[PDB]
Design a protein around this nucleic acid. Structure first.
Ligand SMILES: [Mg+2]
Ligand SMILES: [Mg+2]
Ligand SMILES: [Mg+2]
Ligand SMILES: [Mg+2]
Ligand SMILES: [Mg+2]
Ligand SMILES: [Mg+2]
Ligand SMILES: [Mg+2]
Ligand SMILES: [Mg+2]
Ligand SMILES: [Mg+2]
Ligand SMILES: [Mg+2]
Ligand SMILES: [Mg+2]
Ligand SMILES: [Mg+2]
Ligand SMILES: [Mg+2]
Ligand SMILES: [Mg+2]
Ligand SMILES: [Mg+2]
Ligand SMILES: [Mg+2]
Lengths: 121, 54, 117, 214, 113
RNA sequence: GUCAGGUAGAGAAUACUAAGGCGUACGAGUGAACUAUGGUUAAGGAACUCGGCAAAAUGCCCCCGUAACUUCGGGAGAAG
RNA sequence: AAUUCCUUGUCGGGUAAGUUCCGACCUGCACGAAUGGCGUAACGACUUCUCAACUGUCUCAACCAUAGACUCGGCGAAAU
RNA sequence: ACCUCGAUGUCGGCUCGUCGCAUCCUGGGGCUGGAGCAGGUCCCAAGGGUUGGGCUGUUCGCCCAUUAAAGCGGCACGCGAGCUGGGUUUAGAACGUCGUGAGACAGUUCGGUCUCUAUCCGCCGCGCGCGUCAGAAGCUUGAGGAAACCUGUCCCUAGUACGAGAGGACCGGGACGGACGAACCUCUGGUAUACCAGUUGUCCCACCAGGGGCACGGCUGGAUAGCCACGUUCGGACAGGAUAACCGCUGAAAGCAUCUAAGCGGGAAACCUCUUCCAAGACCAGGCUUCUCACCCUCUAGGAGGGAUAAGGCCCCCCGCAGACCACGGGAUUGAUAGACCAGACCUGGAAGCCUAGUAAUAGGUGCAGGGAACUGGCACUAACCGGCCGAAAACUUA
């Protein structure tokens, strides 16, 4: 359940180590953002000499959350590390390669690129 | 919070009459040949003699 | 042994267990106890469970009885004298009666006894 | 038109749809119901049908209810409810002594259940109306869970009759509308209402045809 | 007695192989990737099993790419078609939650030899 | 002001206990809200607040290793 | 600037966001050399900011045991 | 300065709301220097919503993400017998200035007790007594009140209408979103003070083993039941009647004209039904049914009084997810209402003993073993008892 002022790892090759969610989108006032939800964050720590650096506000899709997420068939999914992937302007993974797994919930729409880039699920 | 005015005699007695008691129901019991009144709650104990009768 | 579902009988926790243990001991020792209504009510199932353990007592049950009762003589008599005396009764060995209240605190008083038949 | 029957809330369970989707349902024992009385416009002034539910021995039934059931021509029951229809043309479909069962509802339909919600006793404002608790630190002087202010300084005088305050919640009649009837088992006269209906287990409830989606 | 047994047994699932928490197991789950009913394999260790009759569930933990994933499934769910237990587990607890902080040599569990 | 037992513990602190002294003076029940002391908690982890205010966090014995500065003692039990 | 009313003076750093904080510019209403001018190694239950952990302060509230509140028996005030 | 200095506690922040539209949006309409999207202006419309953070006490204001919106005001610049004390406005001390001085500076800076057991009205819920012309028991129409009224993304129409191009529709439908509220434990989690297992210190049951008290339930791994949300469903309607702005139809006064003077229409989240709840103390005290529908005594028969009864109710008692008490619901020997016992589901992890391998801790068969409270079905083994109290008709007029 990612919300405002929540730190979370980045799964990409953009240098950003961990970002900090600012506010959730897709609603007037959304408290939490589960798997497949886009949010705005700011790079708090990145690899020296990377594309993005500390202080650059960007957008990222919430994937690989920690809290349990229920499916339509009664199953549940939960990871051990709150992560996300920095998305491009409209809809695209900012980067070239993903490292950690991704939740199948991303398959809703417009995330086929991320689903194919993620080497799992 | 303190009483501003003096409660009237009627306003006092109307509620003071509520501070009453309810008499308990009695039951006739034959013990040692004599009949005596004991509530139904202690009726069972009256037969065995676990209820002192002054 | 059902939870009291509310404020315990004897002050705070860790005391109701000892109270029930002492009450069951006194009951199994004397054959009749006179206590408060709620105390006897809470003791009824405790005493019945102890009596069932005694009935089933062949081994490993003396330990279950001793982990709750401390009087060795009381445990011995409960295991020997009572023993199979209730081997035919399929439960309900403790009879509860209500008596007149005592002075001072108007606490409903009850009396527990062991059915003899 | 507006079908209806009385049942009992047994418990909630899960079922699986044809597409491998989980569905939480509630089992309602819509047992047989006897039609006792038919209130018409000329007799009372409205179209309604009285249904009975629950088994009861003839010893416990009361003499007035016993005489009423005798005049109706059926045996006594525990609970008695009444369903108010919309017209005499619809109320004419029911007759005294008729027996209704769970066959009156088909799979996939929508119903509106009515029951008596559970009782929570004297619950505070935070539990009654979802009030927002105050600060638990920074000097809170015994205001952790009370609402606090109540109205205007000196203009209103009264406290605007109808304010949300502490009291006894629950234990009132509630109606959950637009519940999907998953399945109807005729062998046992049971319905699988999609969702959670009000009322405790083993409590009487009234299922009726939906109004907004009937 | 499970009063609602007369409604649960109608949908209960048979051919459920015996399994306990701590035993290595792989489950085959049906998925639809763009109108294509395929079978995905998920291999791991059963960390718990909450008994609820028809609602009985079981969770499996798997380490992949240095990241742990806990997947919970209902035992009698229809989306499953195979639950193969590869090696039994010799554990003491009933809900192996403590495995959420072990890695590799520490996360290993014994087997019933 | 004087007696200073034992068990772990560096210890007259801490937990229990030997002899000794007490259950001390209103009591019995009731899962109401609420008042005050503790226990627990999925996710965020100071985002509440003027203010990390209160709780929590590091906390003990043996070792590797400890910066800027400095009046050369210290910082230092630094940190890890 | 515990000194500046104009002032949230201007630049750089910190946070995505800083009337707070640090250095500099000097336009010193109304700093200034024993009512001392420039800080200090160590230090302060003196004030402020930031940094890693941490937690119910908060999102967001939820339950458990105690003494009251609640019922019973006895005693039995109060300010107005 | 007209009550108030023999006391009306002053600014912000938290909880709590109430009311107006000079309306931020949602809704409708007129004019546009309105080709369309996107805009400017006006009229009606308050049913609903009107975010989270950094600065500074702050109100206010700036900035960061959004959002159809981050609206203006009254209610002692709402709310301290609800809270906070950050500042203002006590007592201490310092900076700069003022005065030879004690001291002062709507200049600054560090700190600086927030009292009261609710008397009456007001409010949230629950009882007692009586009335509804005999005592009651069931099912209900219902005046009159309470509850909700939010809204965004994408996909067809249609890359069509429009438009040189860029750009880009109204209307009509479909799918999916955020918030609020109701229900529930079915899934996931939080709580489990008589539940299971590991363990440090200590004492004890003579001693080993096995157990018990204390140190937060001593600490954790959990933990079925009730409750809860972080979990699952459900409400926002559709439709009908009359309207504000507006658009109109036939039409004179005034041979034409005109939405009006006589009439007839469309017209919005506004108004009333329509969705949920309460409601016959609604004193017009309601309506449809059923049971009892009969016994004595005194006053001097005018009426009244007492006693005893039928249905019914209540008292005592075992209990509930019903509950502060009260009250509600089930039962009471013609009974599974509760306690116990058996069995099932479920929780916990492999119990005491024997034997084996190991000098040793420890592991292995007896063992899905032992233990357990809420969930369920049987079983009268135990308690609902040989038991007590209230409780039923003046009469008269018209048809
Ligand atoms: Mg407090
Ligand atoms: Mg006031
Ligand atoms: Mg004393
Ligand atoms: Mg309590
Ligand atoms: Mg927490
Ligand atoms: Mg955590
Ligand atoms: Mg502190
Ligand atoms: Mg900050
Ligand atoms: Mg000076
Ligand atoms: Mg000096
Ligand atoms: Mg008293
Ligand atoms: Mg005065
Ligand atoms: Mg207007
Ligand atoms: Mg309306
Ligand atoms: Mg803030
Ligand atoms: Mg001073």
């Amino acid at each position: 359940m990612i919300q405002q002022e929540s730190r979370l790892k980045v799964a990409d090759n953009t240098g950003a180590k961990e970002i900090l969610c600012i506010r959730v989108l897709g609603g007037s006032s959304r408290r939490y953002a589960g798997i497949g939800d886009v949010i705005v964050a700011t790079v708090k720590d990145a690899i020296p000499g990377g594309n993005v650096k500390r202080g650059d506000v960007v957008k990222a899709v919430v994937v690989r959350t920690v809290k349990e997420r229920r499916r339509a068939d009664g199953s549940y999914i939960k990871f051990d590390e709150n992560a996300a992937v920095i998305i491009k302007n409209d809809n695209d993974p900012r980067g070239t390669r993903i490292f950690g797994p991704v939740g199948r919930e991303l398959r809703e729409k417009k995330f086929m690129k991320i689903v194919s880039l993620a080497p799992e699920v | 919070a303190v009483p501003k005015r003096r409660m009237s005699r009627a306003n006092t007695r109307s509620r003071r009459a509520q501070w009453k008691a309810e008499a308990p129901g009695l039951v006739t019991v034959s013990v040692a040949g004599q009949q005596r009144k004991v509530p139904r709650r202690l009726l069972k104990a009256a037969r065995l003699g676990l209820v002192d009768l002054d | 042994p059902k939870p009291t579902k509310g404020p315990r009988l004897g002050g705070s926790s860790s005391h109701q267990s000892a109270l029930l243990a002492n009450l069951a001991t006194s009951l199994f020792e004397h054959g009749r106890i006179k206590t408060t209504e709620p105390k006897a009510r809470a003791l009824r199932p405790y005493a019945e469970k102890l009596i069932t353990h005694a009935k089933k007592g062949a081994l490993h049950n003396r330990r279950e009885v001793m982990k709750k009762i401390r009087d060795k003589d009381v445990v011995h008599t409960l295991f020997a004298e009572i023993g199979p005396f209730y081997a035919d009764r399929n439960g309900g060995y403790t009879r509860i009666i209500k008596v007149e209240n005592r002075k001072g605190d108007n606490a409903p008083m009850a009396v527990i006894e062991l059915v003899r038949e | 038109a507006r079908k209806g029957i009385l049942g009992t809330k047994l418990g909630m369970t899960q079922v699986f749809d044809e597409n491998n989707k989980v569905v939480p349902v509630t089992v309602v024992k819509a047992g047989p119901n006897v039609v006792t009385r038919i209130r018409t416009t000329e007799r009372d002034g409205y179209s309604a049908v009285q249904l009975a539910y629950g088994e009861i021995s003839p010893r416990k039934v009361i003499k007035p209810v016993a005489g009423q059931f005798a005049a109706a021509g059926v045996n006594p029951r525990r609970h008695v409810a009444e369903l108010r229809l919309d017209d005499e043309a619809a109320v004419a479909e029911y007759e005294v002594g008729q027996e209704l069962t769970a066959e009156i509802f088909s799979d996939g339909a929508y119903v509106d259940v009515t029951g008596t919600s559970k009782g929570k006793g004297f619950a505070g404002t935070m539990k009654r109306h979802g009030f927002r608790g105050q600060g638990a630190a920074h000097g809170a002087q015994a205001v952790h869970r009370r609402p606090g202010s109540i109205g205007g300084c000196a203009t209103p005088g009264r406290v605007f009759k109808g304010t949300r305050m502490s009291g006894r919640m629950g234990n009132d009649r509630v109606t959950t509308q637009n519940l999907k009837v998953h399945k109807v088992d005729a062998e046992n006269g049971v319905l699988l209402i999609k969702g959670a209906i009000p009322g405790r287990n083993g409590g009487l409830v009234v299922v009726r045809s939906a109004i907004k989606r009937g | 007695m499970n009063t609602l047994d007369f409604v649960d047994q109608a949908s209960l699932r048979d051919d459920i192989p015996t399994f306990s928490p701590g035993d290595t197991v792989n489950v085959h789950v049906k998925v639809i990737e763009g109108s294509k009913e395929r079978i995905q394999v998920f291999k791991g260790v059963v960390i718990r099993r909450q008994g609820g009759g028809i609602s009985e569930t079981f969770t499996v933990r798997k380490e992949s790419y240095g990241v742990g994933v806990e997947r919970t499934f209902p035992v009698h769910s229809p989306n499953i078609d195979h639950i193969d237990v590869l090696t039994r587990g010799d554990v003491r607890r009933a809900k192996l939650y403590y495995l959420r902080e072990l890695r590799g040599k520490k996360a290993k569990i014994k087997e019933k030899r």
